[PDB]
């Protein structure tokens, strides 16, 4: 279906739904909570989602957002993701599940219906991950199907980074480009038939999780989807 929205900043959150630990703060989307002294709260997850559902049959889309990761230690956890899931998808487990999976089913592709681009700050021992911080494409599992090294210089930069995520509904390819101002650039693409996974309605949004010593903020977000016919 056709949907477009545009938040050049989050001085408005008019169409955003907040769930779990996520809230509007400092004219951003703050995905995980901080205490009264600004300290990241451990073992929490949050979602901030565009409230209106859309459909993916015979559709392409483009979305872009800017983000900051604030860390208070050399051992931050766990990161965040942009995701697509059905409209009733809730905030799931905190920690390495990224708010997107339940522990009992996190690597069982038949038991999930969620696609994400993850920004992973903590190498988990509990399932297969690369031994470095990474950006990945997740299809129905916390074990990414396509993963690339995320440089620690960029992780810890405190810069406002940009992500571009597109889906070509003809070739059935999901792509992410991630760019840092005067830092790294990252490119990942994967063939995945989203309309097969999601024959009905979906919502798009962000999920963050702790972990420890980390807060994730979305600074701007725009989206457009168009028919392929």
């Amino acid at each position: 279906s056709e949907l477009s929205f545009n938040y050049p900043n989050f001085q408005s959150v008019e169409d955003i739904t907040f769930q779990g630990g996520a809230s509007p703060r400092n004219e951003t989307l703050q995905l995980t909570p901080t205490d009264s002294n600004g300290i990241p709260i451990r073992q929490r997850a949050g979602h901030a989602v565009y409230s209106q559902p859309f459909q993916l049959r015979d559709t392409s889309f483009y979305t872009t957002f800017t983000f900051v990761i604030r860390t208070t230690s050399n051992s931050p956890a766990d990161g965040f993701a942009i995701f697509i899931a059905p409209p009733d998808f809730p905030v799931k487990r905190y920690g390495g599940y990224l708010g997107l999976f339940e522990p009992n089913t996190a690597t069982n592709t038949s038991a999930n219906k969620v696609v994400a681009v993850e920004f992973d700050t903590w190498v988990n021992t509990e399932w297969k991950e690369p031994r470095y911080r990474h950006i990945g494409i997740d299809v129905n599992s916390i074990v990414s199907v396509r993963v690339t090294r995320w440089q620690d210089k960029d992780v810890f930069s405190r810069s406002i980074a940009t992500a571009h995520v597109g889906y070509d509904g003809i070739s059935k390819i999901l792509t992410a480009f991630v760019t840092y101002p005067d830092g790294g650039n990252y490119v990942l693409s994967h063939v995945v038939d989203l309309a097969e996974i999601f024959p009905g309605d979906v919502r798009i949004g962000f999920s963050g999780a702790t972990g420890q010593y980390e807060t994730q903020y979305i600074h701007s977000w725009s989206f457009s989807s168009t028919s392929t016919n």
Partner: peptide, 4 residues
């Protein structure tokens, strides 16, 4: 695991 880090859980707990």
């Amino acid at each position: 695991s880090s859980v707990g």
